[PDB]
Design a protein around this ligand. Structure first.
Ligand SMILES: C[C@@H]1O[C@@H](O)[C@@H](O)[C@H](O)[C@@H]1O
Ligand SMILES: [Ca+2]
Ligand SMILES: [Cl-]
Length: 158
């Protein structure tokens, strides 16, 4: 992706994030859904820039972009201090409307697996129209995202 004449922008920092259920207890303060769109890829969960679900099965995290965009890819930063294997199987769904918390929207990509602390771009089959981007983890693992960037192409500046 990223053709001549165009520039790419992360429109996720313009939105509002939320998740199925936040991690409770001792580290609950470092777990806010908003952490995945604060413009910081720091993957050390203890620095406070990563989200963390409750631990209950099939968690999801979502960002409402506030308006519809044509999205080319989504760049994810996996947790780095530990537990990089938990995100395996995660699905990135993108849609104009919220079809069951975004969990049932069209799929951009599936995260096979990512090394601990890895930042990787997942390109959608074709550009997708959507206002909501959801990361659904259909397993018994905790979902922790250190950054979710939603990439939109724009004609370049100058
Ligand atoms: C915030 C915590 O980080 C590590 O201690 C993990 O083993 C826990 O399951 C939890 O994710
Ligand atoms: Ca972050
Ligand atoms: Cl905000």
């Amino acid at each position: 992706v990223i053709p001549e004449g165009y520039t790419q922008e992360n429109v996720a920092v313009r939105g509002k994030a939320t998740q199925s259920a936040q991690l409770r207890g001792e580290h609950a303060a470092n777990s806010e859904a908003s952490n995945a769109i604060d413009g910081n890829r720091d993957s050390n969960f203890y620095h406070g820039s990563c989200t963390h679900s409750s631990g209950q099965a099939n968690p999801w995290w979502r960002v409402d972009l506030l308006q519809v965009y044509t999205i080319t890819s989504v760049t994810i930063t996996n947790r780095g201090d530990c537990c990089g294997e938990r995100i395996s199987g995660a699905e990135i769904n993108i849609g104009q409307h919220l079809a069951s918390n975004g969990v049932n929207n069209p799929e951009c990509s599936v995260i096979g697996s990512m090394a601990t602390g890895e930042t990787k771009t997942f390109h959608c089959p074709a550009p997708m129209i959507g206002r909501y981007v959801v990361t659904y983890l259909p397993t018994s693992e905790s979902l922790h995202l250190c950054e979710v960037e939603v990439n939109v192409d724009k004609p370049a500046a100058a």
